[PDB]
Amino acid sequence: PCSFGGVSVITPGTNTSNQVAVLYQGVNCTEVNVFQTRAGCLIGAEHVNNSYECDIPIGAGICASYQTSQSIIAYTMSLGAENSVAYSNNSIAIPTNFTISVTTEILPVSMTKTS
Amino acid sequence: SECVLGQSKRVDFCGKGYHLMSFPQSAPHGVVFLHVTYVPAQEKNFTTAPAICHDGKAHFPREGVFVSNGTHWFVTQRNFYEPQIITTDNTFVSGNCDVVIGIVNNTVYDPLQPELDSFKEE
Amino acid sequence: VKQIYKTPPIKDFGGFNFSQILPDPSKPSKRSFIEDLLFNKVTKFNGLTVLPPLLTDEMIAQYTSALLAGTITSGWTFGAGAALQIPFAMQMAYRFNGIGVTQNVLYENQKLIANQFNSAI
Numbered sequence: 001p002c003s004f005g006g007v008s009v010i011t012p013g014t015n016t017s018n019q020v021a022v023l024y025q026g027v028n029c030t031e032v033n034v035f036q037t038r039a040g041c042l043i044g045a046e047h048v049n050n051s052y053e054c055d056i057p058i059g060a061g062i063c064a065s066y067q068t069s070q071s072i073i074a075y076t077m078s079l080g081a082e083n084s085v086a087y088s089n090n091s092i093a094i095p096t097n098f099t100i101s102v103t104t105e106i107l108p109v110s111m112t113k114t115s
Numbered sequence: 116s117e118c119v120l121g122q123s124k125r126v127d128f129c130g131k132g133y134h135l136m137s138f139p140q141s142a143p144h145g146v147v148f149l150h151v152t153y154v155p156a157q158e159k160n161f162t163t164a165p166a167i168c169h170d171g172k173a174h175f176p177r178e179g180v181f182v183s184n185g186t187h188w189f190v191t192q193r194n195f196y197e198p199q200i201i202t203t204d205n206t207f208v209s210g211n212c213d214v215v216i217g218i219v220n221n222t223v224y225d226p227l228q229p230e231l232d233s234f235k236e237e
Numbered sequence: 238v239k240q241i242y243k244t245p246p247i248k249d250f251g252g253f254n255f256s257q258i259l260p261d262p263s264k265p266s267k268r269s270f271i272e273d274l275l276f277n278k279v280t281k282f283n284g285l286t287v288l289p290p291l292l293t294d295e296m297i298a299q300y301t302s303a304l305l306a307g308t309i310t311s312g313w314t315f316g317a318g319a320a321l322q323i324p325f326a327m328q329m330a331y332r333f334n335g336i337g338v339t340q341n342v343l344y345e346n347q348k349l350i351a352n353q354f355n356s357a358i
């Protein structure tokens with residue numbers, strides 16, 4: 001059976017711009033700025049080799065964002081800043097001052113008793 | 116239960132950090148907790164040591180570890196920096212100090228001996 | 238985890254061995270021996286679209302290696318706040334003090350404990 005796929009659109013919010021990004025699922029670009037993933041064919045973006053945090057997930061470690069003209073870019077998502085701690089057999093990390101933070105957490109409890 | 120009615124030990128369960136206490140608030144179809152943690156900052160680096168031998172006898176600290184004030188071996192607890200002088204009531208003694216690997220050298224101050232020293236002066 | 242931690246190239250931990258759970262840098266997909274045993278002992282045109290996960294197995298391995306290294310080098314402190322370094326032996330002492338055993342029991346039986354741990358691994 002000749003190839004098919006799901007049609008999916010990548011975009012920022014309408015309160016930013018109206019530029020788009022077109023993603024074809026599970027089939028590569030030879031049958032439709034062209035970029036290829038394991039997810040399929042992504043049209044309407046630009047491959048960048050800088051690592052940011054993810055904005056919208058796409059698949060296979062690929063996320064897209066709309067930054068500064070201004071256009072759709074995509075990249076391989078990071079896992080935050082690379083960091084390591086100096087280790088020895090005679091070192092330790094001991095604090096001296098502190099803060100008191102408050103984090104909002106929200107859990108849903110009930111729903112409307114429909115009948 | 117665990118975070119409003121009392122103080123859970125369970126880390127990573129009500130907010131991020133050592134859990135202190137919380138406050139609940141009303142919400143439509145829901146609840147909103149406000150957790151209060153103890154997040155530390157502003158650290159230095161500190162040369163450490165597992166124990167101290169004084170007169171052949173080892174010393175393990177009752178709480179805390181032995182810390183750095185520069186190149187000296189003083190002592191405080193494990194989650195806030197407030198160094199102390201090594202006394203007997205901060206440690207205890209179990210065994211010879213030769214099986215203990217990584218041990219360092221320091222004197223151990225005693226509280227009783229200078230109060231004893233006030234007797235032998237007179 | 239808030240940040241990625243990479244293990245140091247120092248493998249002195251008081252005798253404890255973790256080269257069977259830390260990744261080898263030599264692999265193309267950085268994974269450990271036990272991870273490789275795990276990933277090998279787990280075995281259309283009707284609308285079936287198999288969406289792949291957002292996080293590939295390499296990324297999962299990155300996250301786990303970070304958690305593992307933080308555990309090894311920082312105790313539980315990186316769970317609460319910023320990571321605070323510490324030797325493993327003293328961390329082990331900490332954890333034995335948590336269960337009602339004094340830390341001298343460790344520091345006198347350290348090699349025995351390390352050998353038992355390595356054997357169990």
Ligand SMILES: *[C@@H]1O[C@H](CO)[C@@H](O)[C@H](O)[C@H]1NC(C)=O
Nearest residue numbers: 012013014015016017018066
């Ligand atoms: C969203 O749109 C409204 C009306 O177009 C505008 O007033 C508002 O500033 C926009 N939000 C942002 C963050 O620009």
Ligand SMILES: *[C@@H]1O[C@H](CO)[C@@H](O)[C@H](O)[C@H]1NC(C)=O
Nearest residue numbers: 027028029030031036037038
């Ligand atoms: C589409 O199939 C595979 C998968 O990406 C790719 O290697 C191949 O080159 C593509 N087909 C053509 C004709 O380029």
Ligand SMILES: *[C@@H]1O[C@H](CO)[C@@H](O)[C@H](O)[C@H]1NC(C)=O
Nearest residue numbers: 046047048049050051073075
């Ligand atoms: C992307 O990779 C190419 C080589 O494949 C490199 O020349 C280029 O500088 C990279 N892009 C960025 C923004 O670093």
Ligand SMILES: *[C@@H]1O[C@H](CO)[C@@H](O)[C@H](O)[C@H]1NC(C)=O
Nearest residue numbers: 085086087091158159160161
């Ligand atoms: C001193 O502390 C800093 C803060 O993390 C650390 O980067 C550095 O390695 C420490 N110095 C030594 C000699 O370990």
Ligand SMILES: *[C@@H]1O[C@H](CO)[C@@H](O)[C@H](O)[C@H]1NC(C)=O
Nearest residue numbers: 088089090164216217218249
């Ligand atoms: C730490 O390791 C070094 C290896 O260079 C060794 O010389 C030293 O005795 C060790 N110190 C402790 C306290 O384990």
